[PDB]
Design a protein. Sequence first.
Length: 230
Amino acid sequence: ETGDQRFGDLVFRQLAPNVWQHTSYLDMPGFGAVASNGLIVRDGGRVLVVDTAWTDDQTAQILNWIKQEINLPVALAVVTHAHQDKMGGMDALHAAGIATYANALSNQLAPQEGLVAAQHSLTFAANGWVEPATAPNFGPLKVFYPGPGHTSDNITVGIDGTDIAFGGCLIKDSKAKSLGNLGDADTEHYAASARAFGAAFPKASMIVMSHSAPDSRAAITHTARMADKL
Ligand SMILES: [Zn+2]
Ligand SMILES: [Zn+2]
Ligand SMILES: [Zn+2]
């Protein structure tokens, strides 16, 4: 936590020369603050964002941090499924003029989940890789749909040119006691989807997730083993 920066209500952690983790918190009374993590990636003269914060105001703070610390324009944001911790700040991205992308299924589910859809839809091949025409100019972001797990629409993102891959809410840390929120989950296919994420990015050694600090690939294997028991 030495290299963690407090900026407003958020926390930023540099993971690589060109990759930062953003963390926002939603306080639930009686339970305490709950963190949600996303990514900020520099790609030459532009910035790419993975996931919003819980709220519009927090997402505006992410943009403010990028402006202060990097001072380059945000080209696009990818959001990894239609839940509040990943898409709760879509209006802030749109007000800033940032192009937003999500799984077509995320955009179709967003209204039913109390959310605004992204402005562009990603589609995927039968083996999970994104159709490149739907992800134009994504630079180092390599988007992979691993199959239904935490939700039916959850997607994951490898950062090409680094050893980092983002599992979102599909992957839990190697010490996790449970798979988190399973209310929208596909318990039948979860284990295969977790393993497919590991197989898509087989050389990623730092696994970033939504609700725990970055971990080793033991996050992937532990998650799959928990899901085997479902
Ligand atoms: Zn979720
Ligand atoms: Zn739901
Ligand atoms: Zn979550």
